[PDB]
């Protein structure tokens, strides 16, 4: 198609089969289809643990820096990958979500302790 | 921890659609209950 | 080739359509009219967001304030209720030019120009004011201008340099050793060149779009 | 209050004015509005200048309305606005002048301080202190208490009306409070300082009974709560001032009454506009009442209270100072007339040149 407007973006293009996802990191005009015309492939992401239990990310950090220097935006999933690698700072919502999970597990632990205390009262009743 | 004046500024801006204030999160990840 | 025939009707339509738009351009009194009972714009039937309902009934538009002043309040200071609530430091416009909408039966819609002073820092040139049709403006009284505009700047405490990300720092130090540069200096990012304005900072009205004149 | 010389119209009537038939000029403006074309400021000026009858005023009122709702509304000249008020007074149409003045947003009549005094003084001499009060409130809405002469006349009308009005509605308290405060701030005399404390008290009443938004909404007043705190500050300033300044006894009683009344009372526009950390004004009333008594004791101890009524103090102030202001204002009035005459001639000359060029353009075309 002959696009009018838009910008270059670095995003994940979904490949693979059903229940077997696999991503290609690519630089593409934002208006193009998710798996369609792209400008350059900048790596790959395999989200399924391998035999060694490792999720494998490949990043062409030399070309990634080139396209960020030319105005390429970044998708939020790609910003999370760059933060986990250490190439970018951790994304604000990566930290907030980790804090929300901590507060939610603290409640669960407290509720289990209260239930155990309630169970202890049942033990006292015998 | 946000300054107390800043927490009040947000309670005025979003008056009527507020949630319970959250304190500092646990220092470590609480061990998963099992 | 040479069988690509000319399309006279298409060229005629384009010009004719463009001409009608210029002739029947809508006015600010029509595009920005509002029905306060339903808080819906008659021109397009767009309902305002819920978070704007309270202020639409409780606050005034800019030219509603200025239509009551001599010379449409040239030289007067005007602030916004959103700024008053969000920022402790003085935020206001110094009005310089004002083009009311004569069509309006109360001269309550129009355009304005002025010099911005946001969070105590003043711009050097006058530009057009955005969001003039918002119910958020508060005229500053003449006797209260001196107390309102009084500001003393605090020394800037936002960091000027920060570390590099963990991987990007290791790649920099590794390059140093490869090139023979021996040093234990910590790579530092400079944040002074790239400091962001607040999200509510006034934007450029001149480059902003205007709604079309086709009613819904 | 003003002298006959201040209200004499020999100078205005002796102005050089072009003679244009209103009917002819009426047609020219009507065609421009039909064609959606801008009308000249000189055109509307010529119409107002050549008003010769009571009926002509009604037509000019319509054309002043049309000019306001036209592309060149901003260019309405000061002398055109002044002549309108002068013509209204000349032919007995004072109600029309007050109507257009109150409906400024529709007609665009924003008179200068000299013009305000001419209209305000007519009502004062006729004894119509209800219309005179309207002129004062319009001056307050426009924040036009710059000239000292206007300040004296405005304070005389306010205090005379307040004495008659034993009962004040909340809107009246707000309008009187703002008018007294703004007019009082300009004056540093005892009457001026008394009017500041009187105004803050009235506005403080509306703040603690109907909320702070009733005071500042649509009013030339600040939006920060604490008007009764401003009133007490005036007492603390006068008491501690090295210079000997006095506050009228009448105002002090008003503030005491306001504090007692508030202290022991018997669609989606509902917002809390004050931060939770900041103390509400109602909770601070106990502390406010202690400050008042301490300040009153210090003032009375220092003999800084004036038993004389505010209406009597203002009358003396007007008699003493108003004569001098009339001479100064009348001197500026003559200068303004000459400035207006020169600017008017420039517009007439510029119009002649463009019309001559228009002929040359048609000759070329
Ligand atoms: Mg926005």
UniProtKB/Swiss-Prot annotation, chain A:
Signal peptide: none annotated. GO terms for cellular component: cytosol; mitochondrial inner membrane; mitochondrial small ribosomal subunit; mitochondrion. One of its GO terms (biological process) is mitochondrial translation. Residues 1-25 form a transit peptide. It is found in: Mitochondrion. It comes from the Eukaryota. Keywords: Mitochondrion, Ribonucleoprotein, Ribosomal protein, Transit peptide. GO terms for molecular function: structural constituent of ribosome. It holds the Pfam family Ribosomal_S16. Belongs to the bacterial ribosomal protein bS16 family. Component of the mitochondrial ribosome small subunit (28S) which comprises a 12S rRNA and about 30 distinct proteins. This is Small ribosomal subunit protein bS16m. It comes from Mus musculus (Mouse).
Curated annotation (Swiss-Prot), chain B:
Residues 23-34 have a biased composition (Pro residues). The chain holds residues 205 to 238 of 254 of the full protein. This is Small ribosomal subunit protein mS40. It is found in: Mitochondrion. Component of the mitochondrial ribosome small subunit (28S) which comprises a 12S rRNA and about 30 distinct proteins. Belongs to the bacterial ribosomal protein bS18 family. Mitochondrion-specific ribosomal protein mS40 subfamily.
UniProtKB/Swiss-Prot annotation, chain C:
It is found in: Mitochondrion. This is Small ribosomal subunit protein mS34. The keyword Ribonucleoprotein applies. Component of the mitochondrial ribosome small subunit (28S) which comprises a 12S rRNA and about 30 distinct proteins. Belongs to the mitochondrion-specific ribosomal protein mS34 family. One of its GO terms (biological process) is mitochondrial translation. The keyword Zinc does not apply. Required for mitochondrial translation, plays a role in maintaining the stability of the small ribosomal subunit and the 12S rRNA that are required for mitoribosome formation. It comes from Mus musculus (Mouse). InterPro entries: Ribosomal_mS34. One of its GO terms (cellular component) is mitochondrial inner membrane. One of its GO terms (molecular function) is structural constituent of ribosome. It comes from the Eukaryota.
Swiss-Prot record, chain D:
Residues 326-365 form a coiled coil. PROSITE patterns: PPR. PPR repeats lie at residues 77-111, 112-147. Its main location: cytoplasm. GO terms for cellular component: mitochondrial inner membrane; mitochondrial small ribosomal subunit; mitochondrion; nucleolus. One of its GO terms (molecular function) is tRNA binding. It holds the Pfam family MRP-S27. GO terms for biological process: cell population proliferation; mitochondrial translation; regulation of translation. InterPro entries: mS27/PTCD2, Pentatricopeptide_rpt, Ribosomal_mS27, TPR-like_helical_dom_sf. The keyword Repeat applies. Keywords: Coiled coil, Cytoplasm, Mitochondrion, Repeat, Ribonucleoprotein, Ribosomal protein, RNA-binding, rRNA-binding, Transit peptide, Translation regulation, tRNA-binding. Gene3D superfamilies: Tetratricopeptide repeat domain. It is found in: Cytoplasm; Mitochondrion. Component of the mitochondrial ribosome small subunit (28S) which comprises a 12S rRNA and about 30 distinct proteins. Interacts with NOA1. Interacts with MIEF1 upstream open reading frame protein. Interacts with METTL17. Belongs to the mitochondrion-specific ribosomal protein mS27 family. RNA-binding component of the mitochondrial small ribosomal subunit (mt-SSU) that plays a role in mitochondrial protein synthesis. Stimulates mitochondrial mRNA translation of subunit components of the mitochondrial electron transport chain. Binds to the mitochondrial 12S rRNA (12S mt-rRNA) and tRNA(Glu). Overexpressed in hepatocellular carcinoma tissues compared with adjacent non-tumoral liver tissues.
């Amino acid at each position: 198609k002959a696009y009018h407007g838009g910008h270059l973006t670095i995003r994940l293009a979904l490949g693979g089969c059903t229940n077997r996802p696999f991503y290609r990191i690519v630089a593409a005009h934002n208006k193009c289809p998710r798996d369609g015309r792209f400008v350059e492939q900048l790596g790959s992401y395999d989200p399924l643990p391998n035999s060694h239990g490792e999720k494998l990310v490949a990043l062409n950090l030399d070309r990634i820096r080139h396209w960020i220097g030319c105005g390429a935006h970044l998708s939020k999933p790609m910003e999370k990958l760059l933060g986990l690698s250490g190439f970018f700072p951790l994304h604000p919502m990566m930290i907030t979500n980790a804090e929300r999970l901590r507060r939610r597990r603290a409640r669960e632990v407290l509720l289990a302790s209260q239930k155990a205390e309630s169970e202890a009262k049942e033990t006292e009743a015998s | 921890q946000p300054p107390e004046r800043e927490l009040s500024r947000l309670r005025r801006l979003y008056q009527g659609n507020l949630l319970e204030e959250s304190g500092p999160p646990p220092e470590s990840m609480p061990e998963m209950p099992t | 080739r040479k069988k690509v025939r000319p399309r006279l009707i298409a060229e005629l339509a384009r010009r004719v359509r463009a001409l009608r738009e210029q002739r029947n351009q809508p006015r600010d009194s029509q595009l920005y009219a509002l029905d306060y009972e339903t808080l819906t714009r008659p021109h397009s039937g767009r309902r305002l967001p819920v978070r704007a309902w309270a202020d639409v009934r409780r606050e005034s538009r800019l030219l509603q304030l200025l239509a009551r002043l001599p010379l449409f309040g040239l030289g007067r200071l005007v602030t916004r209720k959103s700024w008053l609530w969000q920022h402790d430091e003085p935020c206001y416009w110094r009005l310089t030019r004002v083009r009311p909408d004569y069509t309006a039966q109360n001269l309550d819609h129009g355009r304005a120009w002025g010099i911005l002073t946001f969070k105590g820092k003043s711009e050097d040139t006058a530009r057009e004011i955005e969001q003039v049709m918002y119910h958020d403006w508060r005229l500053v009284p003449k006797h209260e201008e001196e107390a309102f505009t009084a500001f003393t700047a605090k020394p800037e405490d936002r960091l000027n340099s920060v570390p590099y990300p963990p991987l990007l720092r290791a790649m920099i130090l590794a390059e140093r050793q490869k090139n023979g540069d021996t040093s234990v200096q910590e790579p530092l990012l400079n944040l002074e060149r790239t400091r962001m304005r607040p999200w509510d900072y006034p934007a450029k009205q001149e480059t902003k779009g205007r709604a079309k004149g086709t009613p819904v | 209050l003003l002298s006959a010389a201040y209200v004499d119209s020999h100078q205005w009537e002796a102005r050089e004015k072009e003679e244009y038939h209103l009917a002819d000029l009426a047609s020219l403006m009507d065609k421009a509005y039909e064609r959606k074309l801008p009308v000249s400021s000189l055109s509307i000026s010529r119409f107002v200048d050549n008003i010769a009858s009571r009926e002509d005023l009604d037509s000019a009122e319509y054309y002043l309305y049309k000019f306001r709702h036209s592309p060149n509304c901003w260019y309405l000249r000061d002398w055109t606005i002044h002549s309108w008020i002068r013509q209204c007074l000349k032919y007995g149409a004072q109600d029309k002048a007050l109507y257009t003045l109150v409906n400024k947003v529709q007609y665009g009549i924003f008179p200068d301080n000299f013009t305000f005094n001419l209209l305000m003084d007519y009502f004062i001499k006729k004894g119509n202190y209800k219309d005179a009060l309207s002129v004062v409130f319009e001056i307050m809405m426009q924040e036009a208490f710059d000239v000292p002469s206007t300040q004296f006349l405005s304070l005389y009308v306010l205090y005379r009306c307040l004495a008659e009005k034993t009962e004040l509605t909340w809107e009246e308290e707000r309008d009187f409070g703002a008018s007294l405060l703004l007019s009082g701030l300009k004056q540093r005399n005892t009457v001026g300082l008394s009017s500041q404390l009187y105004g803050y008290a009235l506005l403080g009443k509306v703040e603690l009974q109907r909320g702070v938004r009733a005071v500042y909404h649509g009013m030339p007043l600040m939006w920060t709560p604490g008007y009764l705190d401003r009133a007490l500050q005036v007492m603390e300033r006068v008491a501690s001032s090295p210079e000997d300044l006095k506050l009228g006894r009448e105002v002090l009683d008003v503030l005491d009454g306001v504090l007692k009344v508030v202290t022991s009372p018997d669609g989606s526009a509902n917002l809390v506009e004050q931060l939770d950390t900041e103390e509400p004004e109602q909770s601070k009333l106990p502390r406010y009442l202690e400050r008042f008594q301490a300040s009153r004791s210090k003032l009375q101890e220092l003999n800084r209270v004036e038993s004389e009524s505010l209406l009597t103090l203002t009358t003396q102030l007007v008699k003493e100072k108003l004569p001098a202001c009339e001479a100064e204002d009348l001197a500026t009035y003559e200068q303004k007339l000459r400035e207006w005459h020169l600017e008017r001639v420039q517009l007439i000359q510029r119009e002649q040149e463009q019309r001559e060029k228009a002929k040359q353009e048609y000759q070329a075309l």
